Amino acid sequence: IDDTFLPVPEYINQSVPKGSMKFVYKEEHPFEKRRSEGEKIRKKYPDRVPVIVEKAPKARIGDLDKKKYLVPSDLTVGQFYFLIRKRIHLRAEDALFFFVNNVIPPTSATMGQLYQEHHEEDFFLYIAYSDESVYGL
Numbered sequence: 001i002d003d004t005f006l007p008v009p010e011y012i013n014q015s016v017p018k019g020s021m022k023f024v025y026k027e028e029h030p031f032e033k034r035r036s037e038g039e040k041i042r043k044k045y046p047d048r049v050p051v052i053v054e055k056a057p058k059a060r061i062g063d064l065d066k067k068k069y070l071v072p073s074d075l076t077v078g079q080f081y082f083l084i085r086k087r088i089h090l091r092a093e094d095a096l097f098f099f100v101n102n103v104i105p106p107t108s109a110t111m112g113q114l115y116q117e118h119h120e121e122d123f124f125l126y127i128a129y130s131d132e133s134v135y136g137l
């Protein structure tokens, strides 16, 4: 963009609050250890994306046993909703919301698309989940 204008998307890859979200996994694993494992795992399973899934702050919902997932890039957000919903025995009337950088990702996006836009410097994609549709509420 030197003869044309480069636009900025709306509410897509923004992270206005909290910046990069706070995660217990980051506090418990130092950065260089995470980055080293992220690089190696992207080379070993290039068709899969490493995802960290943790409960959002103030969320009222069952905790997740395993937080480290290796997800096929072609998998959509909706299928990931389906998978996480089963692992915590969510009832039919229980809601489930994902947040990536304090933003709800489109249900029709693939995990590879989210990875490319939101992966952090350790080569991991971080997803928080909640029973509420607003992060931290």
Ligand SMILES: [Cl-]
Pocket (backbone or CB within 6 Å): 073, 112, 113, 115, 116
């Ligand atoms: Cl990808």
